[PDB]
Amino acid sequence: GAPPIMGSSVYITVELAIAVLAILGNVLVCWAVWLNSNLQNVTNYFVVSLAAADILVGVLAIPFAITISTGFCAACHGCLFIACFVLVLAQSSIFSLLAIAIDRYIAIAIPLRYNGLVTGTRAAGIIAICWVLSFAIGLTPMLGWNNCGQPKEGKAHSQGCGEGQVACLFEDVVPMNYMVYFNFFACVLVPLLLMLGVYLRIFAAARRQLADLEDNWETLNDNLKVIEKADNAAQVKDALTKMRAAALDAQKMKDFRHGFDILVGQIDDALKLANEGKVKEAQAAAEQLKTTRNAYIQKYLERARSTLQKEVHAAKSAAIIAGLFALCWLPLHIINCFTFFCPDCSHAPLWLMYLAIVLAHTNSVVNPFIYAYRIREFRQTFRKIIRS
Ligand SMILES: CC(C)CCC[C@@H](C)[C@H]1CC[C@H]2[C@@H]3CC=C4C[C@@H](O)CC[C@]4(C)[C@H]3CC[C@]12C
Ligand SMILES: CC(C)CCC[C@@H](C)[C@H]1CC[C@H]2[C@@H]3CC=C4C[C@@H](O)CC[C@]4(C)[C@H]3CC[C@]12C
Ligand SMILES: CC(C)CCC[C@@H](C)[C@H]1CC[C@H]2[C@@H]3CC=C4C[C@@H](O)CC[C@]4(C)[C@H]3CC[C@]12C
Ligand SMILES: CCCCCCCC/C=C\CCCCCCCC(=O)OC[C@H](O)CO
Ligand SMILES: Nc1nc(NCCc2ccc(O)cc2)nc2nc(-c3ccco3)nn12
Ligand SMILES: CCCCCCCC/C=C\CCCCCCCC(=O)O
Ligand code: NA
Protein backbone atom coordinates (compact mmCIF):
# COMPACT_ATOMS: atom_id res chain seq x y z
CA GLY A 1 0.00 0.00 0.00
CA ALA A 2 2.07 2.90 -1.39
CA PRO A 3 1.66 6.25 0.41
CA PRO A 4 -1.49 7.68 -1.17
CA ILE A 5 0.23 11.04 -1.70
CA MET A 6 2.42 9.51 -4.50
CA GLY A 7 -0.36 8.37 -6.82
CA SER A 8 -2.27 11.47 -5.74
CA SER A 9 0.73 13.61 -6.74
CA VAL A 10 0.73 12.15 -10.26
CA TYR A 11 -3.02 12.56 -10.74
CA ILE A 12 -3.02 16.12 -9.43
CA THR A 13 -0.06 17.26 -11.54
CA VAL A 14 -1.69 15.86 -14.64
CA GLU A 15 -5.03 17.48 -13.84
CA LEU A 16 -3.25 20.79 -13.39
CA ALA A 17 -1.42 20.49 -16.71
CA ILE A 18 -4.75 19.72 -18.44
CA ALA A 19 -6.39 22.74 -16.76
CA VAL A 20 -3.66 25.16 -18.00
CA LEU A 21 -4.00 23.85 -21.56
CA ALA A 22 -7.82 23.86 -21.50
CA ILE A 23 -7.80 27.52 -20.38
CA LEU A 24 -5.15 28.70 -22.83
CA GLY A 25 -6.57 27.09 -25.95
CA ASN A 26 -10.20 27.93 -25.30
CA VAL A 27 -9.44 31.56 -24.33
CA LEU A 28 -7.69 31.74 -27.72
CA VAL A 29 -10.89 30.48 -29.43
CA CYS A 30 -12.99 33.12 -27.65
CA TRP A 31 -10.48 35.86 -28.47
CA ALA A 32 -10.47 34.89 -32.18
CA VAL A 33 -14.25 35.09 -32.46
CA TRP A 34 -14.30 38.40 -30.56
CA LEU A 35 -11.68 39.94 -32.84
CA ASN A 36 -12.56 38.63 -36.32
CA SER A 37 -15.93 39.61 -37.84
CA ASN A 38 -15.51 36.75 -40.34
CA LEU A 39 -15.84 34.39 -37.34
CA GLN A 40 -18.92 36.17 -35.94
CA ASN A 41 -21.81 33.97 -36.99
CA VAL A 42 -24.38 31.81 -35.26
CA THR A 43 -22.42 28.61 -35.64
CA ASN A 44 -19.49 30.19 -33.87
CA TYR A 45 -21.62 31.57 -31.01
CA PHE A 46 -22.26 27.95 -30.07
CA VAL A 47 -18.50 27.29 -30.52
CA VAL A 48 -17.85 30.04 -27.95
CA SER A 49 -20.41 28.66 -25.50
CA LEU A 50 -18.60 25.33 -25.85
CA ALA A 51 -15.20 26.99 -25.28
CA ALA A 52 -16.60 28.76 -22.18
CA ALA A 53 -17.65 25.42 -20.75
CA ASP A 54 -14.15 24.10 -21.42
CA ILE A 55 -12.56 27.17 -19.76
CA LEU A 56 -14.76 26.43 -16.75
CA VAL A 57 -13.49 22.82 -16.71
CA GLY A 58 -10.04 24.22 -16.19
CA VAL A 59 -10.88 26.92 -13.66
CA LEU A 60 -13.53 25.06 -11.60
CA ALA A 61 -14.21 21.42 -12.47
CA ILE A 62 -10.55 20.33 -12.29
CA PRO A 63 -9.94 22.07 -8.93
CA PHE A 64 -13.18 20.38 -7.78
CA ALA A 65 -12.05 16.94 -9.09
CA ILE A 66 -8.73 17.30 -7.25
CA THR A 67 -10.64 18.24 -4.08
CA ILE A 68 -13.07 15.31 -4.15
CA SER A 69 -10.28 12.81 -4.87
CA THR A 70 -9.01 13.53 -1.28
CA GLY A 71 -12.22 12.37 0.35
CA PHE A 72 -12.13 15.38 2.68
CA CYS A 73 -14.81 15.85 5.32
CA ALA A 74 -17.70 17.96 4.08
CA ALA A 75 -21.37 18.64 4.49
CA CYS A 76 -23.00 16.26 2.09
CA HIS A 77 -24.82 18.93 0.07
CA GLY A 78 -21.69 21.02 -0.44
CA CYS A 79 -19.97 17.81 -1.47
CA LEU A 80 -22.71 17.26 -4.05
CA PHE A 81 -22.06 20.58 -5.67
CA ILE A 82 -18.30 19.87 -5.93
CA ALA A 83 -19.13 16.46 -7.38
CA CYS A 84 -21.84 17.54 -9.83
CA PHE A 85 -20.76 20.91 -11.23
CA VAL A 86 -18.76 19.16 -13.97
CA LEU A 87 -22.00 17.52 -15.11
CA VAL A 88 -23.40 21.01 -15.72
CA LEU A 89 -20.46 21.75 -18.01
CA ALA A 90 -20.71 18.48 -19.86
CA GLN A 91 -24.44 18.93 -20.40
CA SER A 92 -23.89 22.39 -21.74
CA SER A 93 -21.30 20.97 -24.17
CA ILE A 94 -23.85 18.41 -25.34
CA PHE A 95 -26.35 21.22 -26.00
CA SER A 96 -23.82 23.34 -27.89
CA LEU A 97 -22.79 20.32 -29.94
CA LEU A 98 -26.39 19.47 -30.77
CA ALA A 99 -27.03 23.13 -31.66
CA ILE A 100 -24.03 23.25 -33.99
CA ALA A 101 -25.24 20.10 -35.79
CA ILE A 102 -28.77 21.42 -36.25
CA ASP A 103 -27.44 24.78 -37.42
CA ARG A 104 -25.38 23.11 -40.16
CA TYR A 105 -28.37 20.95 -41.23
CA ILE A 106 -30.54 24.06 -41.61
CA ALA A 107 -27.79 25.71 -43.58
CA ILE A 108 -27.53 22.88 -46.10
CA ALA A 109 -31.22 21.90 -46.25
CA ILE A 110 -32.80 25.34 -46.53
CA PRO A 111 -30.03 27.77 -47.43
CA LEU A 112 -32.68 30.22 -48.68
CA ARG A 113 -34.30 30.73 -45.28
CA TYR A 114 -31.24 30.07 -43.10
CA ASN A 115 -30.40 33.75 -42.58
CA GLY A 116 -33.97 34.72 -41.73
CA LEU A 117 -34.52 31.79 -39.37
CA VAL A 118 -31.18 31.38 -37.57
CA THR A 119 -30.24 34.78 -36.12
CA GLY A 120 -27.65 35.89 -33.61
CA THR A 121 -30.35 37.22 -31.29
CA ARG A 122 -32.20 33.87 -31.25
CA ALA A 123 -28.89 32.00 -30.88
CA ALA A 124 -28.09 33.99 -27.74
CA GLY A 125 -31.51 33.21 -26.26
CA ILE A 126 -31.02 29.53 -27.00
CA ILE A 127 -27.55 29.53 -25.37
CA ALA A 128 -28.96 31.14 -22.20
CA ILE A 129 -31.78 28.57 -22.02
CA CYS A 130 -29.36 25.69 -22.57
CA TRP A 131 -27.11 26.90 -19.72
CA VAL A 132 -30.13 27.06 -17.36
CA LEU A 133 -31.20 23.56 -18.42
CA SER A 134 -27.65 22.27 -17.92
CA PHE A 135 -27.63 23.53 -14.33
CA ALA A 136 -31.03 21.83 -13.76
CA ILE A 137 -29.86 18.47 -15.22
CA GLY A 138 -26.35 18.43 -13.71
CA LEU A 139 -27.40 19.60 -10.24
CA THR A 140 -30.49 17.36 -10.12
CA PRO A 141 -28.85 15.37 -7.26
CA MET A 142 -28.91 18.56 -5.17
CA LEU A 143 -32.70 18.49 -5.63
CA GLY A 144 -32.86 15.24 -3.60
CA TRP A 145 -31.66 12.42 -5.85
CA ASN A 146 -28.58 11.82 -3.70
CA ASN A 147 -27.24 9.44 -1.06
CA CYS A 148 -27.07 12.14 1.68
CA GLY A 149 -29.90 10.38 3.54
CA GLN A 150 -27.74 7.24 3.84
CA PRO A 151 -24.27 8.45 4.78
CA LYS A 152 -21.39 6.03 5.19
CA GLU A 153 -20.95 6.68 8.91
CA GLY A 154 -18.16 4.18 9.52
CA LYS A 155 -16.11 5.90 6.86
CA ALA A 156 -17.01 9.37 8.21
CA HIS A 157 -15.91 8.39 11.75
CA SER A 158 -12.65 6.79 10.61
CA GLN A 159 -11.66 10.07 8.97
CA GLY A 160 -12.69 12.04 12.04
CA CYS A 161 -15.51 13.85 10.25
CA GLY A 162 -17.78 15.99 12.32
CA GLU A 163 -21.43 15.49 12.92
CA GLY A 164 -23.42 15.91 9.73
CA GLN A 165 -20.32 15.52 7.54
CA VAL A 166 -19.29 12.71 5.22
CA ALA A 167 -16.10 11.73 3.50
CA CYS A 168 -16.60 13.60 0.23
CA LEU A 169 -16.26 10.87 -2.39
CA PHE A 170 -18.07 10.85 -5.75
CA GLU A 171 -19.62 7.39 -5.62
CA ASP A 172 -20.64 7.78 -2.00
CA VAL A 173 -22.84 10.85 -2.58
CA VAL A 174 -23.94 10.71 -6.26
CA PRO A 175 -26.42 7.86 -6.95
CA MET A 176 -25.28 5.50 -9.68
CA ASN A 177 -28.87 5.04 -10.97
CA TYR A 178 -28.82 8.82 -11.59
CA MET A 179 -25.47 8.55 -13.34
CA VAL A 180 -26.45 5.66 -15.59
CA TYR A 181 -30.16 6.13 -16.41
CA PHE A 182 -30.57 9.88 -16.16
CA ASN A 183 -27.22 11.38 -16.83
CA PHE A 184 -25.76 8.85 -19.27
CA PHE A 185 -28.72 7.24 -21.08
CA ALA A 186 -31.21 10.11 -21.17
CA CYS A 187 -28.97 13.17 -21.06
CA VAL A 188 -25.82 12.07 -22.95
CA LEU A 189 -26.39 9.02 -25.15
CA VAL A 190 -29.77 10.09 -26.51
CA PRO A 191 -28.41 13.54 -27.55
CA LEU A 192 -25.29 12.00 -29.03
CA LEU A 193 -27.39 9.56 -31.08
CA LEU A 194 -29.57 12.45 -32.22
CA MET A 195 -26.39 14.26 -33.33
CA LEU A 196 -25.41 11.18 -35.28
CA GLY A 197 -28.81 11.24 -36.98
CA VAL A 198 -28.48 14.89 -37.90
CA TYR A 199 -24.95 14.45 -39.32
CA LEU A 200 -26.21 11.51 -41.36
CA ARG A 201 -28.90 13.82 -42.75
CA ILE A 202 -26.38 16.58 -43.47
CA PHE A 203 -24.10 14.28 -45.46
CA ALA A 204 -26.94 12.59 -47.33
CA ALA A 205 -28.37 16.00 -48.22
CA ALA A 206 -25.01 17.24 -49.53
CA ARG A 207 -24.52 14.12 -51.61
CA ARG A 208 -28.05 14.44 -52.99
CA GLN A 209 -27.47 18.06 -53.90
CA LEU A 210 -24.14 17.41 -55.64
CA ALA A 211 -25.69 14.55 -57.61
CA ASP A 212 -28.54 16.82 -58.70
CA LEU A 213 -26.06 19.48 -59.87
CA GLU A 214 -24.28 16.94 -62.03
CA ASP A 215 -27.52 15.41 -63.31
CA ASN A 216 -28.71 18.81 -64.49
CA TRP A 217 -25.39 19.50 -66.23
CA GLU A 218 -25.50 16.08 -67.90
CA THR A 219 -29.14 16.63 -68.90
CA LEU A 220 -28.34 19.97 -70.51
CA ASN A 221 -25.55 18.38 -72.51
CA ASP A 222 -27.41 15.23 -73.53
CA ASN A 223 -30.37 17.29 -74.72
CA LEU A 224 -28.05 19.44 -76.82
CA LYS A 225 -26.78 16.28 -78.51
CA VAL A 226 -30.35 15.00 -78.97
CA ILE A 227 -31.17 18.26 -80.76
CA GLU A 228 -28.08 18.02 -82.97
CA LYS A 229 -28.97 14.63 -84.43
CA ALA A 230 -32.71 15.19 -84.49
CA ASP A 231 -34.27 15.00 -87.95
CA ASN A 232 -37.69 16.66 -87.60
CA ALA A 233 -38.92 19.74 -85.79
CA ALA A 234 -40.99 17.76 -83.29
CA GLN A 235 -37.88 16.12 -81.81
CA VAL A 236 -36.08 19.43 -81.40
CA LYS A 237 -39.21 20.67 -79.64
CA ASP A 238 -39.44 17.80 -77.15
CA ALA A 239 -35.79 18.16 -76.10
CA LEU A 240 -36.03 21.95 -75.77
CA THR A 241 -39.14 21.55 -73.61
CA LYS A 242 -37.11 19.39 -71.23
CA MET A 243 -34.21 21.83 -71.33
CA ARG A 244 -36.50 24.76 -70.54
CA ALA A 245 -38.04 23.03 -67.50
CA ALA A 246 -34.58 22.05 -66.22
CA ALA A 247 -33.30 25.59 -66.75
CA LEU A 248 -35.98 27.24 -64.63
CA ASP A 249 -35.40 24.41 -62.18
CA ALA A 250 -31.65 25.02 -62.01
CA GLN A 251 -32.47 28.72 -61.65
CA LYS A 252 -33.66 27.99 -58.11
CA MET A 253 -25.69 36.90 -58.55
CA LYS A 254 -26.23 39.49 -61.23
CA ASP A 255 -23.67 37.74 -63.45
CA PHE A 256 -25.49 34.47 -62.60
CA ARG A 257 -29.01 35.76 -63.26
CA HIS A 258 -27.90 37.21 -66.59
CA GLY A 259 -26.63 33.73 -67.53
CA PHE A 260 -29.88 31.87 -66.89
CA ASP A 261 -31.86 34.70 -68.52
CA ILE A 262 -29.74 34.20 -71.66
CA LEU A 263 -30.18 30.45 -71.32
CA VAL A 264 -33.97 30.45 -71.09
CA GLY A 265 -34.21 33.13 -73.73
CA GLN A 266 -32.17 31.06 -76.17
CA ILE A 267 -34.23 27.95 -75.47
CA ASP A 268 -37.38 30.03 -76.20
CA ASP A 269 -35.90 31.28 -79.49
CA ALA A 270 -35.19 27.71 -80.51
CA LEU A 271 -38.62 26.43 -79.43
CA LYS A 272 -40.40 29.09 -81.43
CA LEU A 273 -38.38 28.24 -84.56
CA ALA A 274 -39.13 24.56 -83.95
CA ASN A 275 -42.86 25.22 -83.52
CA GLU A 276 -42.87 26.92 -86.94
CA GLY A 277 -41.30 23.74 -88.34
CA LYS A 278 -37.89 25.28 -89.10
CA VAL A 279 -35.62 22.41 -87.98
CA LYS A 280 -32.29 23.64 -89.36
CA GLU A 281 -32.96 27.15 -87.99
CA ALA A 282 -33.90 25.59 -84.64
CA GLN A 283 -30.80 23.40 -84.44
CA ALA A 284 -28.57 26.37 -85.31
CA ALA A 285 -30.33 28.46 -82.65
CA ALA A 286 -29.94 25.69 -80.11
CA GLU A 287 -26.22 25.47 -80.86
CA GLN A 288 -25.80 29.00 -79.42
CA LEU A 289 -26.64 27.52 -76.04
CA LYS A 290 -23.07 26.21 -76.05
CA THR A 291 -21.67 29.73 -75.74
CA THR A 292 -23.89 30.41 -72.72
CA ARG A 293 -22.96 27.08 -71.13
CA ASN A 294 -19.24 27.75 -71.48
CA ALA A 295 -19.39 31.37 -70.28
CA TYR A 296 -22.02 31.11 -67.50
CA ILE A 297 -23.53 27.73 -66.63
CA GLN A 298 -20.21 25.99 -66.08
CA LYS A 299 -19.09 28.74 -63.70
CA TYR A 300 -22.43 28.34 -61.92
CA LEU A 301 -21.98 24.57 -61.64
CA GLU A 302 -18.41 24.92 -60.38
CA ARG A 303 -19.23 27.51 -57.71
CA ALA A 304 -22.24 25.53 -56.49
CA ARG A 305 -20.18 22.33 -56.20
CA SER A 306 -17.50 24.28 -54.37
CA THR A 307 -19.95 25.79 -51.89
CA LEU A 308 -21.35 22.32 -51.14
CA GLN A 309 -17.89 20.80 -50.74
CA LYS A 310 -17.05 23.59 -48.26
CA GLU A 311 -20.21 22.81 -46.30
CA VAL A 312 -19.30 19.13 -46.26
CA HIS A 313 -15.80 19.92 -44.99
CA ALA A 314 -17.22 22.20 -42.28
CA ALA A 315 -19.75 19.57 -41.23
CA LYS A 316 -16.97 17.00 -40.92
CA SER A 317 -15.00 19.35 -38.65
CA ALA A 318 -18.06 19.82 -36.40
CA ALA A 319 -18.72 16.05 -36.32
CA ILE A 320 -15.09 15.28 -35.41
CA ILE A 321 -15.60 17.57 -32.42
CA ALA A 322 -18.80 15.77 -31.36
CA GLY A 323 -17.12 12.37 -31.94
CA LEU A 324 -14.17 13.32 -29.78
CA PHE A 325 -16.47 14.38 -26.95
CA ALA A 326 -18.06 10.92 -27.15
CA LEU A 327 -14.66 9.20 -27.23
CA CYS A 328 -13.34 11.15 -24.21
CA TRP A 329 -16.43 10.80 -21.99
CA LEU A 330 -17.72 7.30 -22.88
CA PRO A 331 -15.05 5.36 -20.96
CA LEU A 332 -16.18 6.90 -17.66
CA HIS A 333 -19.85 6.37 -18.46
CA ILE A 334 -19.17 2.78 -19.45
CA ILE A 335 -17.27 2.10 -16.21
CA ASN A 336 -20.26 3.49 -14.30
CA CYS A 337 -22.45 1.04 -16.20
CA PHE A 338 -20.25 -1.88 -15.02
CA THR A 339 -20.30 -0.63 -11.43
CA PHE A 340 -24.10 -0.34 -11.53
CA PHE A 341 -25.27 -3.23 -13.65
CA CYS A 342 -22.62 -5.75 -12.49
CA PRO A 343 -22.38 -5.72 -8.67
CA ASP A 344 -20.82 -9.26 -8.94
CA CYS A 345 -17.90 -7.67 -10.88
CA SER A 346 -14.99 -6.22 -8.99
CA HIS A 347 -15.04 -2.42 -9.10
CA ALA A 348 -12.83 -0.95 -11.80
CA PRO A 349 -9.46 -0.26 -10.12
CA LEU A 350 -8.65 3.21 -8.85
CA TRP A 351 -5.91 3.81 -11.44
CA LEU A 352 -8.47 3.21 -14.23
CA MET A 353 -11.07 5.46 -12.57
CA TYR A 354 -8.58 8.31 -12.53
CA LEU A 355 -7.38 7.54 -16.04
CA ALA A 356 -11.00 7.79 -17.23
CA ILE A 357 -11.48 11.06 -15.38
CA VAL A 358 -8.41 12.69 -16.89
CA LEU A 359 -9.36 11.42 -20.36
CA ALA A 360 -12.71 13.12 -19.97
CA HIS A 361 -10.95 16.32 -18.83
CA THR A 362 -8.59 16.19 -21.81
CA ASN A 363 -11.57 16.72 -24.11
CA SER A 364 -11.48 20.34 -22.92
CA VAL A 365 -8.06 20.71 -24.60
CA VAL A 366 -8.73 19.21 -28.04
CA ASN A 367 -11.21 21.52 -29.78
CA PRO A 368 -8.83 24.50 -30.34
CA PHE A 369 -6.50 22.07 -32.18
CA ILE A 370 -9.33 20.80 -34.40
CA TYR A 371 -10.23 24.40 -35.26
CA ALA A 372 -6.61 25.31 -36.01
CA TYR A 373 -6.01 22.28 -38.24
CA ARG A 374 -9.34 22.33 -40.08
CA ILE A 375 -10.66 25.92 -40.25
CA ARG A 376 -8.44 28.45 -42.01
CA GLU A 377 -10.18 31.53 -40.67
CA PHE A 378 -9.51 30.24 -37.15
CA ARG A 379 -5.95 29.15 -37.92
CA GLN A 380 -5.14 32.51 -39.48
CA THR A 381 -6.68 34.45 -36.62
CA PHE A 382 -4.76 32.36 -34.09
CA ARG A 383 -1.57 33.22 -36.00
CA LYS A 384 -2.24 36.97 -35.93
CA ILE A 385 -3.10 36.77 -32.24
CA ILE A 386 0.01 34.77 -31.37
CA ARG A 387 2.38 36.81 -33.57
CA SER A 388 1.18 40.08 -32.06
C1 LIG B 1 -17.58 32.31 -9.16
C2 LIG B 1 -16.65 31.24 -8.65
C3 LIG B 1 -15.19 31.69 -8.72
C4 LIG B 1 -17.07 30.85 -7.26
C5 LIG B 1 -16.60 29.50 -6.78
C6 LIG B 1 -17.13 29.18 -5.38
C7 LIG B 1 -16.95 27.72 -4.92
C8 LIG B 1 -15.48 27.34 -4.85
C9 LIG B 1 -17.69 27.44 -3.59
C10 LIG B 1 -19.23 27.69 -3.72
C11 LIG B 1 -19.93 26.57 -2.92
C12 LIG B 1 -18.81 26.04 -2.04
C13 LIG B 1 -19.04 24.76 -1.22
C14 LIG B 1 -20.20 24.98 -0.25
C15 LIG B 1 -20.23 24.00 0.88
C16 LIG B 1 -19.23 23.21 1.22
C17 LIG B 1 -19.36 22.26 2.39
C18 LIG B 1 -18.17 22.33 3.33
O1 LIG B 1 -18.31 21.32 4.33
C19 LIG B 1 -16.90 22.09 2.56
C20 LIG B 1 -16.74 23.15 1.47
C21 LIG B 1 -17.90 23.17 0.46
C22 LIG B 1 -17.88 21.88 -0.38
C23 LIG B 1 -17.76 24.44 -0.43
C24 LIG B 1 -16.51 24.42 -1.32
C25 LIG B 1 -16.33 25.72 -2.09
C26 LIG B 1 -17.57 26.03 -2.97
C27 LIG B 1 -17.72 24.98 -4.06
C1 LIG C 1 -13.29 3.61 -26.96
C2 LIG C 1 -14.25 3.76 -25.81
C3 LIG C 1 -15.51 4.46 -26.23
C4 LIG C 1 -14.51 2.40 -25.19
C5 LIG C 1 -13.71 2.11 -23.95
C6 LIG C 1 -14.09 0.79 -23.28
C7 LIG C 1 -13.53 0.62 -21.87
C8 LIG C 1 -14.01 1.76 -20.97
C9 LIG C 1 -13.93 -0.77 -21.32
C10 LIG C 1 -13.33 -1.92 -22.17
C11 LIG C 1 -13.05 -3.07 -21.21
C12 LIG C 1 -13.72 -2.65 -19.91
C13 LIG C 1 -13.34 -3.36 -18.61
C14 LIG C 1 -13.59 -4.86 -18.74
C15 LIG C 1 -13.58 -5.55 -17.43
C16 LIG C 1 -13.68 -4.95 -16.25
C17 LIG C 1 -13.61 -5.76 -14.98
C18 LIG C 1 -14.74 -5.39 -14.03
O1 LIG C 1 -14.60 -6.09 -12.80
C19 LIG C 1 -14.73 -3.90 -13.77
C20 LIG C 1 -14.92 -3.13 -15.07
C21 LIG C 1 -13.81 -3.44 -16.09
C22 LIG C 1 -12.47 -2.89 -15.57
C23 LIG C 1 -14.19 -2.80 -17.46
C24 LIG C 1 -14.21 -1.27 -17.44
C25 LIG C 1 -14.53 -0.63 -18.78
C26 LIG C 1 -13.57 -1.11 -19.87
C27 LIG C 1 -12.13 -0.67 -19.55
C1 LIG D 1 -21.13 2.76 -27.59
C2 LIG D 1 -22.51 3.34 -27.84
C3 LIG D 1 -23.04 2.94 -29.20
C4 LIG D 1 -23.54 2.90 -26.85
C5 LIG D 1 -23.08 2.68 -25.42
C6 LIG D 1 -22.87 1.20 -25.09
C7 LIG D 1 -23.02 0.83 -23.60
C8 LIG D 1 -24.35 1.34 -23.06
C9 LIG D 1 -22.81 -0.68 -23.39
C10 LIG D 1 -21.52 -1.18 -24.09
C11 LIG D 1 -20.99 -2.37 -23.26
C12 LIG D 1 -22.12 -2.63 -22.25
C13 LIG D 1 -21.79 -3.44 -21.01
C14 LIG D 1 -21.19 -4.79 -21.40
C15 LIG D 1 -21.16 -5.74 -20.25
C16 LIG D 1 -21.87 -5.62 -19.14
C17 LIG D 1 -21.76 -6.65 -18.04
C18 LIG D 1 -23.11 -7.12 -17.54
O1 LIG D 1 -22.90 -7.93 -16.40
C19 LIG D 1 -23.96 -5.93 -17.14
C20 LIG D 1 -24.12 -4.97 -18.31
C21 LIG D 1 -22.79 -4.44 -18.87
C22 LIG D 1 -22.09 -3.56 -17.81
C23 LIG D 1 -23.07 -3.65 -20.19
C24 LIG D 1 -23.80 -2.32 -19.94
C25 LIG D 1 -23.99 -1.43 -21.17
C26 LIG D 1 -22.69 -1.22 -21.95
C27 LIG D 1 -21.72 -0.38 -21.09
C1 LIG E 1 -12.98 33.31 -11.62
C2 LIG E 1 -11.76 32.47 -11.23
C3 LIG E 1 -11.74 32.32 -9.71
C4 LIG E 1 -10.95 31.09 -9.27
C5 LIG E 1 -11.83 30.28 -8.30
C6 LIG E 1 -10.96 29.22 -7.60
C7 LIG E 1 -11.45 27.82 -7.89
C8 LIG E 1 -11.88 27.14 -6.61
C9 LIG E 1 -10.72 26.29 -6.14
C10 LIG E 1 -10.93 25.31 -5.30
C11 LIG E 1 -12.33 25.03 -4.83
C12 LIG E 1 -12.37 23.68 -4.19
C13 LIG E 1 -11.72 23.84 -2.84
C14 LIG E 1 -12.71 23.39 -1.79
C15 LIG E 1 -11.79 22.83 -0.73
C16 LIG E 1 -12.53 22.58 0.55
C17 LIG E 1 -11.45 22.19 1.57
C18 LIG E 1 -12.15 22.12 2.91
O1 LIG E 1 -13.19 22.69 2.97
O2 LIG E 1 -11.60 21.40 3.99
C19 LIG E 1 -12.42 21.41 5.13
C20 LIG E 1 -12.18 20.14 5.93
O3 LIG E 1 -12.56 19.03 5.17
C21 LIG E 1 -12.98 20.17 7.25
O4 LIG E 1 -14.30 20.60 7.05
N1 LIG F 1 -17.64 6.91 -10.93
C1 LIG F 1 -17.08 8.11 -10.76
N2 LIG F 1 -16.18 8.28 -9.75
C2 LIG F 1 -15.52 9.44 -9.65
N3 LIG F 1 -14.61 9.60 -8.66
C3 LIG F 1 -14.37 8.55 -7.71
C4 LIG F 1 -13.42 7.46 -8.24
C5 LIG F 1 -13.45 6.32 -7.24
C6 LIG F 1 -14.31 5.25 -7.41
C7 LIG F 1 -14.47 4.30 -6.41
C8 LIG F 1 -13.78 4.43 -5.21
O1 LIG F 1 -13.95 3.54 -4.19
C9 LIG F 1 -12.91 5.50 -5.04
C10 LIG F 1 -12.73 6.42 -6.05
N4 LIG F 1 -15.73 10.51 -10.48
C11 LIG F 1 -16.65 10.34 -11.43
N5 LIG F 1 -17.06 11.23 -12.35
C12 LIG F 1 -17.96 10.48 -13.10
C13 LIG F 1 -18.67 11.01 -14.25
C14 LIG F 1 -18.82 12.21 -14.80
C15 LIG F 1 -19.64 12.01 -16.02
C16 LIG F 1 -19.88 10.72 -16.08
O2 LIG F 1 -19.30 10.06 -15.01
N6 LIG F 1 -18.13 9.22 -12.70
N7 LIG F 1 -17.31 9.13 -11.62
C1 LIG G 1 -7.40 30.88 -12.67
C2 LIG G 1 -7.84 30.56 -11.23
C3 LIG G 1 -7.98 29.07 -10.90
C4 LIG G 1 -7.57 28.75 -9.45
C5 LIG G 1 -7.24 27.28 -9.21
C6 LIG G 1 -6.79 27.02 -7.76
C7 LIG G 1 -5.96 25.73 -7.63
C8 LIG G 1 -6.50 24.88 -6.49
C9 LIG G 1 -6.13 23.44 -6.65
C10 LIG G 1 -6.96 22.43 -5.97
C11 LIG G 1 -7.53 22.69 -4.60
C12 LIG G 1 -7.75 21.35 -3.90
C13 LIG G 1 -7.87 21.49 -2.39
C14 LIG G 1 -7.70 20.11 -1.74
C15 LIG G 1 -8.77 19.76 -0.72
C16 LIG G 1 -8.23 19.77 0.72
C17 LIG G 1 -7.71 18.41 1.16
C18 LIG G 1 -8.22 18.06 2.52
O1 LIG G 1 -8.85 18.89 3.20
O2 LIG G 1 -8.00 16.93 3.02
NA1 NA H 1 -16.71 20.35 -23.35
UniProtKB/Swiss-Prot annotation:
Keyword annotations from UniProtKB, A to Z: Cell membrane, Disulfide bond, G-protein coupled receptor, Glycoprotein, Membrane, Receptor, Transducer, Transmembrane, Transmembrane helix, Ubl conjugation
Post-translational modification: Ubiquitinated. Deubiquitinated by USP4; leading to stabilization and expression at the cell surface.
Membrane topology: Multi-pass membrane protein
Extracellular side stretches: 4-9, 69-79, 146-175, 342-349
Origin superkingdom: Eukaryota
Cytoplasmic compartment segments: 35-44, 103-122, 201-317
GO CC terms: asymmetric synapse; axolemma; dendrite; glutamatergic synapse; intermediate filament; membrane; neuronal cell body; plasma membrane
Protein's UniProt keywords contain Transmembrane helix: yes
Disulfide-linked positions: 73-161, 76-148, 79-168, 342-345
GO term, biological process aspect, one: inhibitory postsynaptic potential
Residues with glycosylation annotation: 156
GO molecular function term, any single one: enzyme binding
Keyword Membrane: yes
Binding of adenosine, residues: 171, 336, 360-361
Residues spanning the membrane: 10-34, 45-68, 80-102, 123-145, 176-200, 318-341, 350-373
Main location, first listed in the record: membrane
Subcellular location field: Cell membrane
Function: Receptor for adenosine. The activity of this receptor is mediated by G proteins which activate adenylyl cyclase.
Domain comment (free text): The cytoplasmic C-terminal domain is necessary for targeting the non-ubiquitinated form of this protein to the cell surface.
Quaternary organization: Interacts (via cytoplasmic C-terminal domain) with USP4; the interaction is direct. May interact with DRD4. Interacts with NECAB2. Interacts (via cytoplasmic C-terminal domain) with GAS2L2; interaction enhances receptor-mediated adenylyl cyclase activity.
Family to which this protein belongs: Belongs to the G-protein coupled receptor 1 family.
Protein name: Adenosine receptor A2a
